[PDB]
Structure 1
């Protein structure tokens, strides 16, 4: 359809590549899902920059099938909280099933989500399951694409000194999509409450796998 151009690349010496990759790992490794979020204001320009970063993600056939919905208004944050707490309660009681509920004991999560009120910003990431002269276009691998962008967003948040927890509000998508005025070709993928951690924020003492438990070399 259009032209191709030389690729321009920044090369670092090997030593600098080691040190950069090291320190980026160290930076990302300090990231934890934080479920206790201060209501201190965050600068909107930072939120913008992290969403711009997420928007640099690759996507199947260059479709960029993502919408980041940002909610700061307290009335609206609280309506989102009412929906999530209602749905999550049924999820814990009924829909998740015993094994799932057991697998979550160690996180001490339940259906009470105070962070939906207290966090200064909520970011709801919607995938566009298809797109749109005004003709209908395929979104190839939209879920994976949008999840890659989420990864970039998480990295950008960590790099900027903000915290969050990646949530899936199971069975809340349609209610939240309707509430937020999103079109029917958007689904909710993930909800991220963003801000500074609370002073007494806590995290579960989880450990990550060692390198040789995640990387395999062949042949």
Structure 2
């Protein structure tokens, strides 16, 4: 059924629009995945306000196919760390394949993940690959992966705006074990882990360049 209201919208005059879009670009452009996170405590309000932000993503036919699992318990965080090192280490020695580990080299990345223990909160984003109403019939979540991914793009923006850092991780093959560990139901699958907090004093990043605009944008006549 559902009815249809007018849309009220807030416009800015063209000059203001430009300002806000340069500035927002200049802000997002400082976002860098950080793999070295201070142990220092983050305000729980903020973590909430960024998850809230993520939950404003669009989603196939309005299905909102996403769960955000927040872990700050030092002992559950450790248990996650165990599952992921065990798996990542197999992924590096063999599972990923030679080509993938080669391609990874430059980032100086290994199966050791200090941050899963040091980061004050983790965020595990789970997609719901279908759902159930209160009625208990299966519902279809169209384009669930894209939807949750967008939402997730929204998370990254809110974190960077709120002055927190993270890295977007997809720990290969740790899905099923983390589901079970975290008591998530069978219709939910892990899509990303994000460790959240302040960068560590000694935090570094790989000196990578983003592509020039004329290499992501094509105008067509």
TM-score range with shorter-chain normalisation? over 0.9
Q: Which residue of 2 aligns with 1:10?
A: 10
State the distance in 1 between where 2:106 and 2:171 align: 19
State the distance in 1 between where 2:102 and 2:18 align: 41
State the distance in 2 between where 1:2 and 1:181 align: 34
State the distance in 2 between where 1:179 and 1:8 align: 45
Q: Which residue of 2 aligns with 1:99?
A: 99
Q: Which residue of 1 aligns with 2:152?
A: 150
Q: Which runs of 4+ in 1 moved over 2 A?
A: none
Cα deviation digits, residues 113-157 of structure 1 (max 9, x gap): 000000000000000000001211000000000000000000000
Cα deviation digits, residues 1-31 of structure 1 (max 9, x gap): 1100000100000000000000000000000
TM-score (norm 1): 1.00
Q: Aligned-pair RMSD on alpha carbons?
A: 0.4
State the distance in 1 between where 2:136 and 2:98 align: 46
State the distance in 2 between where 1:43 and 1:49 align: 10
* SS state at 1:170 partner: coil
Equivalenced residue count is: 219
TM-score (norm 2): 0.99
State the distance in 1 between where 2:22 and 2:92 align: 40
State the distance in 2 between where 1:70 and 1:194 align: 10
* SS state at 1:79 partner: helix
State the distance in 1 between where 2:165 and 2:100 align: 25
Q: For structure 2, which runs of at least 5 residues remain unmatched after alignment?
A: none
State the distance in 1 between where 2:163 and 2:60 align: 30
* SS state at 1:37 partner: coil
